[PDB]
Design a protein around this ligand. Sequence first.
Ligand SMILES: O=P(O)(O)OC[C@H]1O[C@H](OP(=O)(O)OP(=O)(O)O)[C@H](O)[C@@H]1O
Ligand SMILES: O=P(O)(O)OC[C@H]1O[C@H](OP(=O)(O)OP(=O)(O)O)[C@H](O)[C@@H]1O
Ligand SMILES: O=C(O)c1cccnc1
Ligand SMILES: O=C(O)c1cccnc1
Lengths: 467, 468
Amino acid sequence: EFNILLATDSYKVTHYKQYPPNTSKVYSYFECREKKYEETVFYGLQYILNKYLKGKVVTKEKIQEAKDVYKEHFQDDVFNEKGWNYILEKYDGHLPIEIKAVPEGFVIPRGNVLFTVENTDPECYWLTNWIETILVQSWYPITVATNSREQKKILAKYLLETSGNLDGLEYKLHDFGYRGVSSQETAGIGASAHLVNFKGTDTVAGLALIKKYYGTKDPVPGYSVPAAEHSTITAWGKDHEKDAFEHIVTQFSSVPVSVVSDSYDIYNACEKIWGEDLRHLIVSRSTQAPLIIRPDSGNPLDTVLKVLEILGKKFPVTENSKGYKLLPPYLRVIQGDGVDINTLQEIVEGMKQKMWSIENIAFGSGGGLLQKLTRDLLNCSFKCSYVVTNGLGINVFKDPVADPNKRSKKGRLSLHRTPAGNFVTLEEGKGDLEEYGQDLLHTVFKNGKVTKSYSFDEIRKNAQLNI
Amino acid sequence: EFNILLATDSYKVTHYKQYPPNTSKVYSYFECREKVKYEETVFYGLQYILNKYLKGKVVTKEKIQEAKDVYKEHFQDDVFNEKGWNYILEKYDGHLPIEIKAVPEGFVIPRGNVLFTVENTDPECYWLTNWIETILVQSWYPITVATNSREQKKILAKYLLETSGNLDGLEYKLHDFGYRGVSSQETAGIGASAHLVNFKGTDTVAGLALIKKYYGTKDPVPGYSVPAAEHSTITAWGKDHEKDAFEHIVTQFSSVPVSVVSDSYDIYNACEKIWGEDLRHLIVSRSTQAPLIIRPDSGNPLDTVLKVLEILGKKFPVTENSKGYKLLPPYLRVIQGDGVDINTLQEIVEGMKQKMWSIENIAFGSGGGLLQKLTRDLLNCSFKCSYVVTNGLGINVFKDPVADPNKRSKKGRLSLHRTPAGNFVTLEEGKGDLEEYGQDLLHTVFKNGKVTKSYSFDEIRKNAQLNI
Ligand SMILES: O=P(O)(O)OC[C@H]1O[C@H](OP(=O)(O)OP(=O)(O)O)[C@H](O)[C@@H]1O
Ligand SMILES: O=P(O)(O)OC[C@H]1O[C@H](OP(=O)(O)OP(=O)(O)O)[C@H](O)[C@@H]1O
Ligand SMILES: O=C(O)c1cccnc1
Ligand SMILES: O=C(O)c1cccnc1
């Protein structure tokens, strides 16, 4: 089905004719360039290696298919049929490429090499950057995992300040983004990246991806709870919202249940329906099976604060040991509308200023978590840094006059820890001097084989917060 | 293999227990809610979803068991509706008892109108309508790409018509550079295909196969490209040999158009000294069908384009076209592919016009701005239940949140009509049945596991044309 010969940017089809004659090696690297988001979670390359790059990826039929498409697409014969046939005949269609990468889950400051790519056969000098397009899509799981982890840092800071511990942190940011991403494939990739940091998800696609490509000791990497949507409330008719609420919390009386409460009037629902008519069905619930009230409209901070004020007047509020107000354990709130890293910060800060514990609230995020992200957020970039031409290696780079931020690194690269425990990327082959301890890049792919793999449990450990 | 039982939001697994008892019908609809203002949307992409995910035998015993096993662990509880899915398998050989009606693909519809509706065709499957919300709502993405691409085409058409008097070349003026900048291979194909509704130039090869498989064109392919350099093929020569790289590349591609990225070290030197002097003899000899296309790729986009054009206008023979705008010789063009989105595209063409440069001189490449920097909230894409039957009684249902009237949803059975003035209106509460507005513009496109109406990519392009 998938054809790697048709999985590149069109212009790359023409690059084999553009490199210097007598070029035997093209060596390229990926970084999140330096320019907020000072460090990045490296995640997602193992998916790409296994799904698209390993094994026999070239066949006679795929070559003919590409040749025919490109003849029409370019209105010209430019496709390197010879070079692809070489890989087919010499290597049984396995890519003569070596990729070295930092371990998945590692948290690396901006401006460092995260992986490198080079050809292992001199005839395939053109192949290194053929697969740039595929490999650069690693920007997306890196950026989802990174932005999710930055939200975890905010939640952890405010949970610690308002409650004194981090209990429940892993469930405080729930993935609501399945319908809000651009494809089924993106849903799985993005949901898996969020699960590097959290355990709550409604994007089921992430589970199958992690099981197939990474693996966990536990049966599943992420969990959900029963929850209403507007259709299951509004189907009862507007005059029967109370009947809908009563039915749903009674069907799910012994597990947590989230009930969207803003179909008609969130404030009436909290004060009169939950707070009076159905109060007897709430105060009876277990600490392990709270009602979770879900507003879903209005200004996010103003709505959360007004919902909490209403609930604190109808239910017995305590003051925890840090001085912050706490709803009874059978009652919680989830804000799932308009949540991104900026509004999450605004809400928890507003709660803190009004003396509400972050224990009371959880968040759901859809587009903000999985779709409202681009390759430019972390300046994810893949560039050639080293070539061998006429048997001599030369260090190559770009350095555009009008934008020093786009200057790329020179020569053969390696990643090291510094004496102070930070990270440094050495350029120009200087890692070979061995002044800086071991290279942290490891070979993960060579000549069609995935050579080093990480479980999802290892990745989660590598991506832990300091605290 | 894809499993539609595992292709929904988790909470929807629990919804069959939440609807009113004795509900036999759930009817839902999709709109781009009323809130560049994006007043009209190109409806595109549902036919892909119908064919790839929803048609045919989508339920098997193995898929039911897989979903059962996953949800038991995911919920730590048995809530999965195994019986309901087995009914579909047994009664319909795994085909979905669903009817979907939709506006024709490529149609350009104002915001706030019904675009498609979904309802179950078997009373036992009242829960199925909104199970497939998640899948179907992903149509927001091709809709939004196609719409935003068409809005950029409107800008380009306006300024090309002003500065040149015609629209020659318009379909090649916005090239898709977004393959590496989207979130997956599947997204690349969907989004590139949506851009090809409006344009013919693309480097996102994945779009071609999607169109061939799911829509079809009379022509062999729906989009085209030209040879072009990247920084690796220039810089690999060494900083002191940029001229050698340029000479090699334009000589290799002497009789087709060739784009050459010229900013590796100093775009202004490259234009004035390398192209403008050292290699000028290799440029002024080229065919009108095979221009050199100089590609800056850094700096302030408008300032860089204007300075590149000023340099080239001093080194090459510029003419004045019939509208009074400056025009480079036909063997020389420029493409700006850095930092392009609908806002900077507008700023560049307006700044060119103010400096008396024809838009004939320029084309644009766009990656993330075209295919990735878009969300479901740009057009307020939304799927909502508007009608149910419970105890044999149909009721019109809706949401109307007190703090956001923009989220009010439509009531009852819906239909899309032409007004007497030729505009569009969505009739609510079954009022289309009164036939005061002629016939419903929605067509049944899916019924009981079968695609029942479909559109070629050529028809979609025709429907999506600009008025001009
Ligand atoms: O973070 P987001 O990308 O916005 O996703 C989260 C939203 O999505 C759901 O609503 P729904 O599908 O109704 O969205 P809508 O009201 O905009 O149509 C859900 O109830 C949240 O409000
Ligand atoms: O519109 P965009 O999403 O930005 O994609 C277009 C950019 O992508 C390419 O550069 P490259 O891969 O170098 O991007 P980079 O400079 O960030 O590395 C290309 O030369 C354009 O500059
Ligand atoms: O579980 C939820 O409340 C949910 C999941 C996805 C989208 N909106 C809400
Ligand atoms: O053809 C090009 O110039 C191109 C294609 C994709 C990305 N960047 C540039």
